[PDB]
């Protein structure tokens, strides 16, 4: 009975958000407007007309994308007063936030009021880009003050592997606000998203639409214990806490099992489901010994019987399929959630793994390069960049890579 307000920034933020609500809607029997026991309250609000609307906030610096949603089959769903429209650069993005502060928080504070027990905020956005990273980083810094206790989680979209030129810039500046101004970071690697769409799906030119179909599934599954509540795992923090033992290190990777087909099989049990959630080919992140997990969560939908589950774990302990940390209790959690009373096993993984730092590394290597040449610094140094906050960020980020690597050490 805890609420979650969702912030959607920039094209990416709003296009994966579009898919997210399209999916939650199908599951809670809600139409592109309203209705036809699950907890709808967590993500939905009761309309003053016995109808339903999402606790969502569409924020963009360009009209193109929001008007796509508005001129679509889901225009009636969104709360009209929760949509806001005001530049390629993080700086430009961080800037326009301060300028639109009051207008933005009028919507955020109002939704915050409606809730009777607000747990926290979820921010959907991309790391590269201007809006997502810039306006995203600003909001992240403000939420950390206007609401000190409320938890903050994000589904952050990492670029593919350019054609923006300064992604490594926007990216570093944001990774900083994601390290200290965020409780939980579900990382969505566009590179890994592609490989899948392409391989385990056979699409030569995977579009964002297509790609966001995957993201929607993870976003959807990773919240099933909150929408189809049980005794344990009903708090968002009930999950995040079990996945993040120490702060800072809160960058999680995900993975899904039943990804394709329609061709039938002889038998699919929770066994091969958990076994697969451990094969890197299903892990939606791209990494390239020593590294290990810090925690692992497995959410299974459909029939199961918690006896079969004890058996799958054993086979794993003996087949050395999961390399956990060396400095402590190596354990994978299982949560048997239901599905919606509308259209076999299904599995979603959420792991806090060490090799996640690779992306942070892969970014600094790029930042550094472009930095050592004063590349494109002219467009950013066009607004309160008469010196360097870049240096502050890079160092912070190097800290994240230091502890994530420091975490695979038995010494830790
Ligand atoms: N998965 C996914 N990634 C997206 C989507 N839209 C953009 N991206 C990825 O996000 C990054 C840029 O996102 P974008 O949506 O341009 O941010 P923006 O802030 O809205 O951009 P701007 O307005 O400053 S130019 C790129 O790495 C791109 O690959 C989307 O709908 N889905
Ligand atoms: Mg945009």
UniProtKB/Swiss-Prot annotation:
Alphabetically sorted, this entry's keywords are: Cytoplasm, Cytoskeleton, Disease variant, GTP-binding, Lissencephaly, Microtubule, Nucleotide-binding, Phosphoprotein
Which terms does the UniProt entry file under GO BP?
A: cytoplasmic microtubule organization; meiotic spindle organization; microtubule cytoskeleton organization; microtubule nucleation; mitotic cell cycle; mitotic sister chromatid segregation; mitotic spindle organization
Gene Ontology CC: one annotated term: cytosol
> What PTMs does it carry?
Phosphorylation at Ser-117 by BRSK1 regulates centrosome duplication, possibly by mediating relocation of gamma-tubulin and its associated proteins from the cytoplasm to the centrosome.
Q: Which residues form a coiled coil?
A: none
Keyword Ubl conjugation found = no
List of residues that carry Phosphoserine: 117
Q: Does the keyword Thylakoid apply?
A: no
- Membrane-spanning residues: none
Role of this protein: Tubulin is the major constituent of microtubules, protein filaments consisting of alpha- and beta-tubulin heterodimers. Gamma-tubulin is a key component of the gamma-tubulin ring complex (gTuRC) which mediates microtubule nucleation. The gTuRC regulates the minus-end nucleation of alpha-beta tubulin heterodimers that grow into microtubule protafilaments, a critical step in centrosome duplication and spindle formation.
Q: What is this protein called?
A: Tubulin gamma-1 chain
Classification from the root reads:
Eukaryota, Metazoa, Chordata, Craniata, Vertebrata
């Amino acid at each position: 009975p805890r609420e979650i307000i969702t912030l959607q920034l920039g094209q990416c933020g709003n296009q994966i958000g579009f898919e997210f609500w399209k999916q939650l809607c199908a599951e809670h029997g809600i139409s592109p407007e309203a209705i036809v026991t699950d907890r709808k309250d967590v993500f939905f609000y009761q309309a003053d007309d016995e109808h339903y609307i999402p606790r969502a906030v569409l924020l963009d610096l360009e009209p193109r994308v929001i008007h796509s949603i508005l001129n679509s089959p889901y225009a009636k769903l969104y709360n009209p007063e929760n949509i806001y429209l005001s530049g390629n650069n993080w700086a430009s993005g961080f800037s326009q936030g301060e300028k639109i502060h009051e207008d933005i928080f009028d919507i955020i504070d109002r939704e915050a009021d409606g809730s009777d027990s607000l747990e926290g905020f979820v921010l959907c956005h991309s790391i590269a880009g201007g809006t997502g990273s810039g306006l995203g980083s600003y909001l992240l810094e403000r939420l950390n003050d206007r609401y000190p206790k409320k938890l903050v989680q994000t589904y952050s979209v990492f670029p593919n592997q350019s054609d923006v030129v300064v992604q490594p810039y926007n990216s570093l500046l944001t990774l900083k606000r994601l390290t200290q101004n965020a409780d939980c970071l579900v990382v969505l690697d566009n590179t890994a998203l592609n490989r899948i769409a392409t391989d385990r799906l056979h699409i030569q030119n995977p579009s964002f639409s297509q790609i966001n179909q995957l993201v929607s599934t993870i976003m959807s599954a990773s919240t099933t214990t909150l929408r189809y509540p049980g005794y344990m795992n009903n708090d968002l923090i009930g999950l995040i806490a079990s996945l993040i033992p120490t702060p800072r290190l809160h960058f999680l990777m995900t993975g899904y099992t039943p990804l394709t087909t329609d061709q039938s099989v002889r038998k699919t049990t929770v066994l091969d489901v958990m076994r697969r959630l451990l094969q890197p080919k299903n892990v939606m992140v791209s990494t390239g010994t020593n590294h290990c997990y810090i925690a692992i969560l497995n959410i299974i939908q459909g029939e199961v019987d918690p006896t079969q589950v004890h058996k799958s774990l054993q086979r794993i302990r003996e087949r050395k399929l999961a390399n956990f940390i060396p400095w402590g209790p190596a354990s994978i959690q299982v949560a048997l959630s239901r599905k919606s009373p509308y259209l076999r096993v299904s599995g979603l993984m959420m792991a806090n793994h060490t090799s996640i730092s690779s992306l942070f590394e892969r970014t600094c290597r790029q930042y550094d390069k472009l930095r050592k040449r004063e590349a494109f610094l002219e467009q950013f140094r066009k607004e309160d960049m008469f010196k360097d906050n870049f240096d502050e960020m890079d160092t912070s980020r190097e800290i994240v890579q230091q502890l994530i690597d420091e975490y695979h050490a038995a010494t830790r």
